[PDB]
Structure 1
Amino acid sequence: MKTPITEAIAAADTQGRFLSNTELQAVDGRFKRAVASMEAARALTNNAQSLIDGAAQAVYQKFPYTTTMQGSQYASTPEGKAKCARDIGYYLRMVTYCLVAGGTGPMDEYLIAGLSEINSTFDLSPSWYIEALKYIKANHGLTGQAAVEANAYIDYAINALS
Structure 2
Amino acid sequence: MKTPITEAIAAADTQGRFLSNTELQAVDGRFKRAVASMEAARALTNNAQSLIDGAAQAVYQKFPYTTTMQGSQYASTPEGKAKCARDIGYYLRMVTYCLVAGGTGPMDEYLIAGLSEINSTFDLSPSWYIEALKYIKANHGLTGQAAVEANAYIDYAINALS
1:24 — aligned with what? 24
SS in 2 for 1:112: coil
The structural deviation recorded for 1:139 is: 0.5
SS at structure 2 position matched to 1:7: helix
Q: Which runs of 4+ in 1 moved over 6 A?
A: none
- The structural deviation recorded for 1:112 is 1.1
In 2, Cα distance between equivalents of 1:44 and 1:104: 17
Distance 2:11 2:137 in 1: 34
Structure 1 residue runs without a partner (length 5+) = none
Distance in 1 (alpha carbons) for counterparts of 2:58 and 2:2? 33
Offset at residue 132 of structure 1 (A): 0.4
Match of 1:149 in 2: 149
* Displacement after TM superposition at 1:145 (Å): 0.9
CA distance in 2, matches of 1:137, 1:2: 23
- 1:118-159 CA distances to partner (integer Å, 9 max, x unpaired)? 111010110000100010011011111111110111000001
Matched residue SS, 1:70: coil
Equivalent runs, 1:124-135 vs 2, <5 Å = 124-135=124-135
Per-residue CA deviation, residues 74-97 of structure 1 (Å, 9 max, x unaligned), is 000011001000000001111100
Rounded to whole Å, the distance in 2 between the matches of 1:114 and 1:71 is 23
What is the distance in 2 between the residues matched to 1:79 and 1:58? Answer: 18
- CA shift at 1:14, angstroms? 1.2
The structural deviation recorded for 1:11 is 1.2
Instruction: Tell me the distance in 2 between the aligned counterparts of 1:13 and 1:161.
Output: 33
Separation (CA, whole Å) in 1 of partners of 2:128 and 2:47 = 21
Secondary structure in 2 matching 1:45:
helix
The equivalent of 1:41 in structure 2 is: 41
SS at structure 1 position matched to 2:17? coil
Shift of 1:110: 0.5
- 1:113, distance to aligned residue in structure 2 (A): 1.2
What is the CA distance between 1:64 and its match in structure 2? 0.1
- Give the structure-2-normalised TM-score: 0.98
TM-score (ref. length: structure 1)? 0.98
Residues in 1 aligned to 2:86 and 2:29: alpha-carbon distance in whole angstroms: 35
Output the CA distance in 1 between the equivalents of 2:17 and 2:34: 27
Q: Percent of pairs identical after alignment?
A: 100
- Equivalent residue of 2:24, what SS? helix
Paired with 2:111 and 2:86, the residues of 1 have a C-alpha distance of 13
Q: Which residue pairs with 1:65 in the alignment?
A: 65
